[PDB]
Design a protein around this motif. Structure first.
Motif, PDB file in Angstrom:
ATOM      1  N   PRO A   6      -8.925  12.015  -8.002  1.00 44.08           N
ATOM      2  CA  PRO A   6      -7.732  10.967  -8.100  1.00 44.08           C
ATOM      3  C   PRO A   6      -7.945   9.630  -6.957  1.00 44.08           C
ATOM      4  O   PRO A   6      -8.805  10.064  -6.126  1.00 44.08           O
ATOM      5  N   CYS A   7      -7.600   8.640  -7.630  1.00 41.73           N
ATOM      6  CA  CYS A   7      -8.223   7.173  -7.445  1.00 41.73           C
ATOM      7  C   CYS A   7      -7.792   6.955  -5.874  1.00 41.73           C
ATOM      8  O   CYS A   7      -8.229   6.427  -5.139  1.00 41.73           O
ATOM      9  N   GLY A   8      -6.516   7.297  -5.365  1.00 46.46           N
ATOM     10  CA  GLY A   8      -5.903   7.299  -4.097  1.00 46.46           C
ATOM     11  C   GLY A   8      -5.335   5.795  -4.003  1.00 46.46           C
ATOM     12  O   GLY A   8      -4.464   5.617  -2.955  1.00 46.46           O
ATOM     13  N   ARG A   9      -5.140   4.998  -5.107  1.00 50.68           N
ATOM     14  CA  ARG A   9      -4.554   3.678  -5.022  1.00 50.68           C
ATOM     15  C   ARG A   9      -3.264   3.709  -5.913  1.00 50.68           C
ATOM     16  O   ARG A   9      -2.307   2.793  -5.371  1.00 50.68           O
ATOM     17  N   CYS A  10      -3.192   4.435  -6.988  1.00 48.74           N
ATOM     18  CA  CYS A  10      -1.946   4.410  -7.928  1.00 48.74           C
ATOM     19  C   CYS A  10      -0.859   4.915  -7.267  1.00 48.74           C
ATOM     20  O   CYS A  10      -0.928   5.500  -6.119  1.00 48.74           O
TER      21      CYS A  10
ATOM     22  N   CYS B  16      -0.839   8.641  -7.369  1.00 47.58           N
ATOM     23  CA  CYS B  16      -1.835   9.329  -6.228  1.00 47.58           C
ATOM     24  C   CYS B  16      -0.835   9.129  -4.867  1.00 47.58           C
ATOM     25  O   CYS B  16      -1.127  10.073  -4.026  1.00 47.58           O
TER      26      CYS B  16
HETATM   27 ZN   LIG Z   1      -4.668   7.452  -8.879  1.00 46.98          ZN
END
Ligand SMILES: [Zn+2]
Length: 99
Positions: A79-83, A86
């Motif tokens: 998971p990107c952590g920015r969206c 997330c």
């Molecule tokens: Zn994400």
RNA sequence: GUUAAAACUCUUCUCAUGCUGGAUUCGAAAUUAGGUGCGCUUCGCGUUU
């Protein structure tokens, strides 16, 4: 922070429902009775996953909308952590706000 | 061939007693037992007035 949003969700089935049993011992005990047992608690109550359908739903519609979203369904994804998905449901270090 | 030579500062007595590697920190963060498979096949509401 100072507040917490409690969303109480009551779901009523409009058709048959099947969530398959995940416990090994419950499946092997039921293999001579039902070939597809339903996921039940040990308090004899039906247990459905809810985090993971919500995440898949939000990821498909936010990918369709064009807003930035990663795919946590592809194999061994990070998971990107920015969206926003997330933020609500979690990333590898920030965790899900929506418990 | 030294007012010499000869005579072991020796024996006995435990660095012991008192003091706790303790205090602080959550193996949990990410991952829907999902996907495939039609309760179908066989049997005229007959007969009787
Ligand atoms: Zn994400």
């Amino acid at each position: 922070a100072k507040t917490m949003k409690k969303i109480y969700v009551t779901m009523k089935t409009l058709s048959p429902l099947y969530t398959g049993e995940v416990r090994r011992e419950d499946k092997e005990a039921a293999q001579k009775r039902v070939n597809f047992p339903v996921r039940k608690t040990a308090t004899n109550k039906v247990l459905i996953p809810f985090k993971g359908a919500l995440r898949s739903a939000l990821e498909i519609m936010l990918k369709a909308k064009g807003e930035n979203v990663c795919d946590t369904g592809e194999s061994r994804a990070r998971p990107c952590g920015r969206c926003v998905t997330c933020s609500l449901f979690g990333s590898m270090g920030r965790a899900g706000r929506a418990s």
